Amino acid sequence: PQDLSEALKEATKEVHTQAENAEFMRNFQKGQVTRDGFKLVMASLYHIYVALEEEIERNKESPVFAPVYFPEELHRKAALEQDLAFWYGPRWQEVIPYTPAMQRYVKRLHEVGRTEPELLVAHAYTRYLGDLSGGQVLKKIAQKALDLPSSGEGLAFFTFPNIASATKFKQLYRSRMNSLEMTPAVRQRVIEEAKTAFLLNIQLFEELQELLTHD
């Protein structure tokens, strides 16, 4: 439907559902997550955001991405750095895993950011706004299921400090994205890449599940 944000939601409803029904995520959402599994998602998110934010910076001035460029409100890399230092210790950077499923997610981000910046919006929208909207619920599940100490660290990723109202921010983001000048042909590629984003998360979930069950 007219608005890109609406068309995107309709065409990805199927894969979005498959993403949430993916075993690993399904369990996490049901409160079934382990420290090992949670550490894997956090490490995964770090690699994803590092690559995504790297590509955003390279394209922040392009007419195709500038409208959805909100560095202070959304950057997550720094937050994940604080979090990984807690979950993996002081030497996290040389200990966190970087699996094949994480690698191809990163690869795709770099591909899009370097040659087709017009599609970066598909990843940024689903990743940022998706994480922003589901964070508080996932955070509580994490706290309950993992029983961490009153360390004051480990879940910074789940709080977007520079966004007062998640609802008002999403309204603004969709507005910028919905008023983005794009061809019905370019528009189709973007919707298709939104699909790619969800599919990349599904293959990641499938791998993390496999890793945990066979270690």
From Swiss-Prot:
Q: Which GO annotations describe the biological process of this protein?
A: angiogenesis; cellular response to arsenic-containing substance; cellular response to cadmium ion; cellular response to cisplatin; cellular response to heat; endothelial cell proliferation; epithelial cell apoptotic process; erythrocyte homeostasis
Write down the chemical reaction(s) this protein catalyses. Answer: heme b + 3 reduced [NADPH--hemoprotein reductase] + 3 O2 = biliverdin IXalpha + CO + Fe(2+) + 3 oxidized [NADPH--hemoprotein reductase] + 3 H2O + H(+)
Which residues of this protein are annotated with the site description Important for catalytic activity? Answer: D131
Give the record's membrane topology.
Single-pass type IV membrane protein
The answer to whether keyword Kinase applies is: no
GO cellular component term of the entry, any? nucleus
The entry's family comment says: Belongs to the heme oxygenase family.
Protein name per the record:
Heme oxygenase 1
Gene behind this protein: HMOX1
Instruction: Give the residues of the full protein shown.
Output: 10 to 224 of 288
